[PDB]
Design a protein around this nucleic acid. Sequence first.
RNA 1: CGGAAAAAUUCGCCCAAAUAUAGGGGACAAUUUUUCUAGAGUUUUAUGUAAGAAGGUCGUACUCUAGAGUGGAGAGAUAAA
Length: 53
Amino acid sequence: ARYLANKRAAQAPERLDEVFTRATIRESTAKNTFVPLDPEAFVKAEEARIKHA
RNA sequence: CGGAAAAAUUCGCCCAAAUAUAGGGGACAAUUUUUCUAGAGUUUUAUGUAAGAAGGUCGUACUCUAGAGUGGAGAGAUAAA
Ligand SMILES: [K+]
Ligand SMILES: [K+]
Ligand SMILES: [Mg+2]
Ligand SMILES: [Mg+2]
Ligand SMILES: [Mg+2]
Ligand SMILES: [Mg+2]
Ligand SMILES: [Mg+2]
């Protein structure tokens, strides 16, 4: 019983009055932590070689 | 003691104890793996510069010697001697 009660609370939904009152944070900033490789990493590297030469 | 974004492992950490069997949660922590470039470095003779060291010099003054030099009784010192 002590385990179910504690596990239920840690995975409970936020309060409604907390949802309809808290300001908005764009998901582009609050969830985009992953940093992928530059898709143009190969094109840029080929242009940087020409400019450096 | 110390970056970024992920992953494996410990199950550290937390529920959480009774020195807790067995599990759950994944932010953080430890070992490790793969990527990243903001820290740290390398190249592109920088400029500027009384850091350092070696081998040689220059000059102003000083000093000694010589010219039986010129001159012929003072000089120097001190607040004064
Ligand atoms: K665990
Ligand atoms: K863990
Ligand atoms: Mg790499
Ligand atoms: Mg690069
Ligand atoms: Mg740098
Ligand atoms: Mg120079
Ligand atoms: Mg004479």
